[PDB]
Structure 1
Amino acid sequence: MYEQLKGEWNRKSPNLSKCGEELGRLKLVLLELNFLPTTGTKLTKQQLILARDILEIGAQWSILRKDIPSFERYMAQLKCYYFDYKEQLPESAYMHQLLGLNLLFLLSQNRVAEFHTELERLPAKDIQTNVYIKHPVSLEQYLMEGSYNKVFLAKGNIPAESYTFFIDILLDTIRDEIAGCIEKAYEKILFTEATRILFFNTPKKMTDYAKKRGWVLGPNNYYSFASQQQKPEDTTIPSTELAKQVIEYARQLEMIV
């Protein structure tokens, strides 16, 4: 019953057997009455109000330790408790940026299909208020037309704590398809087009492109290699199987149907 509620709450959480004790608290939560319909005794949702909050900081523990498979394990169980089958849900203030943590977790991993199916459930919540959702959808309204590194010109507007762990993935998921598009028909560019326009005049970003990719800056150019094919054709490989269709045509047309 409320095992170590706010012990290592705000300052740090270096303890490792706390989590098993926190899981030991979570042994009690699913075993008091139930979790799946949670039909009667509205007071048994009151520790589920705090069972939301202990997984919020458990997600804050996962973003402290950079645990991606746990951060979706916490958030899905939270959202399915924000979708408790008796959805009465007295309003906690930490929901609206936790979904913003979910909406920035999901936007930075090319889940644009998962994005636009998420927004169906909160019509006026996502737009008229809730800057922790208004900013990732103004991110996405930036992410429509031409504003994807204009995004980085709007980097310095974080309403919450740092949000660094998912703008770094947003650093990652942009700069690699940047490298993918320069492998394509964008043939070759000199070093200074990689300087002013990618971003960040020269740190070890030049070590980023020379080691993750090729593109070795030799004499005053990034050099492209061969990206073409031969295009062979036989067109009598189908001459075995196009004959199979023609035999089938006169097959059914001759049979007494």
Structure 2
Amino acid sequence: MYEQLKGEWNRKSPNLSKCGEELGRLKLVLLELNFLPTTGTKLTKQQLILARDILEIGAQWSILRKDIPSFERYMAQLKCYYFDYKEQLPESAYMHQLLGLNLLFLLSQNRVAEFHTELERLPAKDIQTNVYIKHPVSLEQYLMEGSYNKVFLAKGNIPAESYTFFIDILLDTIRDEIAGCIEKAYEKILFTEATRILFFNTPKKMTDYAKKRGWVLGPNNYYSFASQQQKPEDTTIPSTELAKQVIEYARQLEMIV
């Protein structure tokens, strides 16, 4: 009935024309069964399982095309499918890492409260199995270290999949943190020693850092001058708020009175 739907899934798509045609094909299903709340007769959710597969690859095509709003839309759809009020559904082979795509992207956005509340659905299951989720939680463990280097050892080997597009964003968002977290405050760091973390050989990223930081560029070495930095005293600056706090404090004494 209806279809042809999954025929374009094995072959995937050469361009975004067939993908847009897949969304236009799914628009008819979205006009008939819509998205919810059809309980049934749960056999009416069978074509919704067949729609979950092409929505999973709809997020693989949303990250393949790099589009951010498309990715979050399709992920809202999948997440709501595993959040459907009927928990009895055929097991999806992608159910595991499809939470890790949005989790690693969410980590690229730096969302602390949503990370922990994401895993709140199955706390004991994410630890015992699903290696695809065990990589981001080991990444969080390594983010309180932080890493930096341990993550660079784990970034060589990832299954992954599709995390290539996300680990590039993770790359840049770590590399600027090398520059931010090295100083303040270190007295000095030798040249090749920082070259060991920036990798490459003689990158222009360290020249752009010689601009961005500024900060200092010294011969065969580097310096946090001057000095460590800005030298807060703060002398008579805090005496203003020290008088000010006592103003309203005396006001509280007068409110008693």
TM-score (norm 2): 0.77
Superposition deviation, residue 235 in structure 1: 13
Say if 1:20 and 1:236 are closer, same or farther in 2 by CA, change over 3 A.
Answer: same
Superposition deviation, residue 143 in structure 1: 2.7
Say if 1:89 and 1:255 are closer, same or farther in 2 by CA, change over 3 A.
Answer: closer
Do the aligned partners of 2:215 and 2:225 also contact (CA within 8 Å) in 1?
no
Do the aligned partners of 1:131 and 1:159 also contact (CA within 8 Å) in 2?
no
SS at match of 2:243: helix
CA shift digits 1:202-231 (9 cap, x unpaired): 344435534665567453344556689999
| Structure 2: 5+ residue stretches without partners | none
Superposition deviation, residue 114 in structure 1: 1.4
Q: Could you tell which deviates more after superposition, 58-67 or 222-231?
A: 222-231
Do the aligned partners of 1:3 and 1:22 also contact (CA within 8 Å) in 2?
no
Superposition deviation, residue 233 in structure 1: 12
Greater fraction helix: 2
Superposition deviation, residue 172 in structure 1: 1.4
Q: Distance in 2 between matches of 1:74 and 1:236?
A: 56
Say if 1:242 and 1:63 are closer, same or farther in 2 by CA, change over 3 A.
Answer: closer
Superposition deviation, residue 80 in structure 1: 1.1
Q: CA RMSD in A?
A: 4.0
CA shift digits 1:161-180 (9 cap, x unpaired): 36221111211121112222
Do the aligned partners of 1:100 and 1:136 also contact (CA within 8 Å) in 2?
yes
**Share of identical aligned residues, percent?**
100
| Structure 1: 5+ residue stretches without partners | none
Aligned length: 257
Q: Distance in 2 between matches of 1:108 and 1:74?
A: 18
SS at match of 2:74: helix
Q: Distance in 2 between matches of 1:135 and 1:200?
A: 25
Say if 1:20 and 1:249 are closer, same or farther in 2 by CA, change over 3 A.
Answer: closer
Q: Distance in 2 between matches of 1:231 and 1:206?
A: 26
Superposition deviation, residue 71 in structure 1: 1.3
Q: Could you tell which deviates more after superposition, 207-216 or 239-248?
A: 239-248
Superposition deviation, residue 45 in structure 1: 0.8
Q: Could you tell which deviates more after superposition, 143-152 or 245-254?
A: 245-254
Do the aligned partners of 1:63 and 1:71 also contact (CA within 8 Å) in 2?
yes
Superposition deviation, residue 87 in structure 1: 2.9
Do the aligned partners of 1:36 and 1:85 also contact (CA within 8 Å) in 2?
no
SS at match of 1:160: coil
TM-score (norm 1): 0.77
Superposition deviation, residue 125 in structure 1: 2.2
What are the residue-to-residue correspondences of 1:42-57 with 2, within 5 Å? Answer: 42-57=42-57
Do the aligned partners of 2:60 and 2:162 also contact (CA within 8 Å) in 1?
no
